[PDB]
Amino acid sequence: TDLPRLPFDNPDIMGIAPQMLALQKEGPIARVGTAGEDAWLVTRYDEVRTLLADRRLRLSNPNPQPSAKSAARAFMVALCAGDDHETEPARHAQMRSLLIPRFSTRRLRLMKTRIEHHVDELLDQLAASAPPVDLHRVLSFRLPTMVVCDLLGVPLADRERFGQWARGTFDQSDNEHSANTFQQVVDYMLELVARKRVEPGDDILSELIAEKDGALSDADIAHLGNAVLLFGYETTIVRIDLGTLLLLRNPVQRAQLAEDPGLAPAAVEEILRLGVGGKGSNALIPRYAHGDITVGETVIRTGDAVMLAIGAANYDDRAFPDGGLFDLTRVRPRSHLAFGHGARHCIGRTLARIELTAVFERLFRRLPDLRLAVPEESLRWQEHRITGGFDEIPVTF
Numbered sequence: 561t562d563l564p565r566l567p568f569d570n571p572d573i574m575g576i577a578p579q580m581l582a583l584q585k586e587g588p589i590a591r592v593g594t595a596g597e598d599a600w601l602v603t604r605y606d607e608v609r610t611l612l613a614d615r616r617l618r619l620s621n622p623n624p625q626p627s628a629k630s631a632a633r634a635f636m637v638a639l640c641a642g643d644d645h646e647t648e649p650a651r652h653a654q655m656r657s658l659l660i661p662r663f664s665t666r667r668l669r670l671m672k673t674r675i676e677h678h679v680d681e682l683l684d685q686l687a688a689s690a691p692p693v694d695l696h697r698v699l700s701f702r703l704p705t706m707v708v709c710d711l712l713g714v715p716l717a718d719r720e721r722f723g724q725w726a727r728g729t730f731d732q733s734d735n736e737h738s739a740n741t742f743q744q745v746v747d748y749m750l751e752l753v754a755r756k757r758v759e760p761g762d763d764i765l766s767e768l769i770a771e772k773d774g775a776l777s778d779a780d781i782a783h784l785g786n787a788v789l790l791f792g793y794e795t796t797i798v799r800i801d802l803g804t805l806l807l808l809r810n811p812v813q814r815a816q817l818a819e820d821p822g823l824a825p826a827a828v829e830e831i832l833r834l835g836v837g838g839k840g841s842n843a844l845i846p847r848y849a850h851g852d853i854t855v856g857e858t859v860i861r862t863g864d865a866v867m868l869a870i871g872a873a874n875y876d877d878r879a880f881p882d883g884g885l886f887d888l889t890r891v892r893p894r895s896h897l898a899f900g901h902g903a904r905h906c907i908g909r910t911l912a913r914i915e916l917t918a919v920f921e922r923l924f925r926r927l928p929d930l931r932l933a934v935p936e937e938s939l940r941w942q943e944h945r946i947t948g949g950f951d952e953i954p955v956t957f
């Protein structure tokens with residue numbers, strides 16, 4: 561008997577930690593230690609998907625004496641309207657009601673066109689530079705920040721101002737830096753709201769200002785803009801990096817995609833399913849039980865913490881034959897869990913898919929000899945950030 565402790569070591573730079581796969585082989589649910597409270601860890605696809613759809617399991621903490629959290633985690637939960645268990649139902653319902661129509665088919669069609677042209681231009685710059693080049697800085701970082709500038713209706717140079725604010729806000733290692741960064745996000749968004757009130761455009765805050773005949777306060781609208789800014793680019797950057805690394809590891813699939821860019825949607829779904837970095841602490845969706853829930857032969861009690869391992873579930877052989885293999889020829893693959901499921905299903909997931917498809921339609925056709933210029937083992941996943949990620953991806957081509 562040895563209680564497992566999150567996070568688990570991963571000897572590889574990607575994939576699932578061996579001890580989490582070991583727990584998965586034993587059963588769907590295990591009690592584990594963490595850096596804070598003990599929690600139930602759920603690692604199999606069926607059970608993770610069932611529990612993400614169970615409304616007894618919520619982001620908000622119902623406990624009378626809640627455990628302490630990093631400033632990074634507190635900001636994240638607040639931005640998700642989960643900081644008060646008594647008001648989370650109405651506040652989270654309103655959050656989703658106000659954000660979902662900001663990603664209409666009209667907006668996504670226009671943005672798809674601009675995204676495709678932007679990747680062409682980014683790759684043209686990449687192709688003309690002398691290697692070695694940091695693919696993360698010149699491609700992975702630039703497309704999603706471009707997209708967020710578009711959603712917010714601000715000049716593209718603004719991304720040089722806000723480009724590290726998701727990383728700083730979600731720095732679990734430095735509470736002072738987290739709060740100082742979040743204050744900069746807040747000041748920026750409040751400036752942005754005040755400008756949009758006299759100079760609206762075709763963008764998200766303008767639409768929120770017009771909403772319900774202007775019934776929302778500037779703080780309400782800035783709060784929603786902060787969620788788009790801090791959730792809307794950093795995780796996409798990370799997926800472009802992991803997708804590139806994954807395709808570099810599988811030359812046969814890479815060659816298939818270069819030959820037929822019609823495989824890019826299939827490649828994108830495989831990248832999302834398998835794209836897990838380092839110790840993979842960001843591939844856990846945290847919850848608290850607001851009522852008792854049975855999972856197999858285990859009772860989750862009201863108040864317990866639960867870690868739903870979407871990364872481990874996406875590797876589950878029970879749901880994906882040869883779950884550890886990158887295969888863009890899978891016939892009717894199950895829907896992966898990388899955008900979550902149920903009440904808090906990723907609001908940006910169709911836009912994120914459009915970005916990832918535009919990149920991987922083009923990347924290896926435009927740069928056929930692209931490859932890492934450093935060993936994989938030199939690539940360092942940033943464990944202290946909620947959103948993880950690599951800081952650089954040196955390439956040659």
Ligand code: HEM
Binds near residue numbers: 788897
């Ligand atoms: C590939 C990139 C992305 C990934 C892997 C991702 C992943 C996720 C996941 C797993 C959740 C569920 C959180 C939970 O269940 O507690 C979530 C929620 C969310 N995502 Fe995404 N996301 C991505 C891109 C985006 C983009 C581009 C946007 C907007 C522009 C966005 C906006 C949101 C918001 C607002 C939520 C909160 C939903 C809620 O709590 O109701 N995300 N995302």
Ligand SMILES: CC1(C)C[C@H]2C=C(C(=O)O)[C@@H]3COC(=O)[C@]4(CO4)[C@]23C1
Binds near residue numbers: 795841844946948
């Ligand atoms: C709102 C989020 C940014 C989306 C989710 C994806 C993430 C990621 O890919 O890094 C974040 C990691 O931390 C979490 O709690 C998550 C898993 O829910 C995320 C919160």
